[PDB]
């Protein structure tokens, strides 16, 4: 069986670690909910 356990509040943290890029990708979504790249 699956169970839930609290992990925290949902708040914006000022001065959180800023990382990650912003790629623009052509993608397709199938009936099973799987995303794939369109080329």
């Amino acid at each position: 069986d699956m169970y839930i356990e609290r992990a925290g509040d949902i708040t914006w943290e000022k001065d959180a670690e800023v990382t990650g890029n912003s790629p623009r990708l052509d993608v397709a979504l199938d009936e099973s909910g799987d995303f794939s790249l369109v080329e």
Binding site: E5, W12, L25, V27
Partner: protein, 156 residues
């Protein structure tokens, strides 16, 4: 069980030890997570039971105890925060500027942050703290890096 608003880990004792299969959001008495985390199964919160209420495999979303409540949207311009809850690790906010998933049915925001599979269902937030979507359904691009969609449901 615990009905306080906040982020929660989705755990299972079926496998070896206690394993974290995902994360979710409690808001207005409803638990929100990704479909691939629970497969639509019932959830336990202490002595209490959470039953599925709405779900969709294509959207890869599921709600418990009531209808989907999260309706905030990425403004398409500003940085956001992934409130990542990794297996066995403390909740941690990560700021990023989202990319774009261009589909035949419109554009969706995307976050290029790489975390373990059991981090699926972690909320993405705007500057106001509102949940604009869940992290965990995406694609693996050329250089093997992971890019998740900012997956948001519909509030009826």
């Amino acid at each position: 069980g615990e009905t306080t608003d906040g982020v929660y880990r989705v755990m299972t004792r079926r496998l070896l030890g206690s394993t974290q299969v995902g994360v979710g959001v409690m808001q207005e008495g409803v638990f929100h997570t990704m479909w691939h985390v629970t497969k639509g199964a019932a959830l336990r919160s202490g002595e209490g039971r959470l039953d599925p209420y709405w779900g969709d495999v294509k959207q890869d979303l599921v709600s418990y105890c009531g209808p989907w409540k999260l309706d905030a949207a990425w403004d398409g311009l500003s940085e956001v925060q992934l409130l990542a809850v990794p297996p066995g690790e403390r909740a941690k906010n990560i700021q990023t500027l989202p990319g774009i998933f261009k589909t035949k049915d419109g554009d969706i925001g995307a976050v290029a942050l790489d975390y373990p599979a059991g981090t699926s269902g972690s909320p993405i937030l705007d500057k106001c703290g509102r949940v604009i979507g869940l992290y965990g359904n995406g694609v693996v691009i050329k250089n093997g890096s992971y890019v998740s969609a900012i997956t948001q449901g519909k509030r009826e």
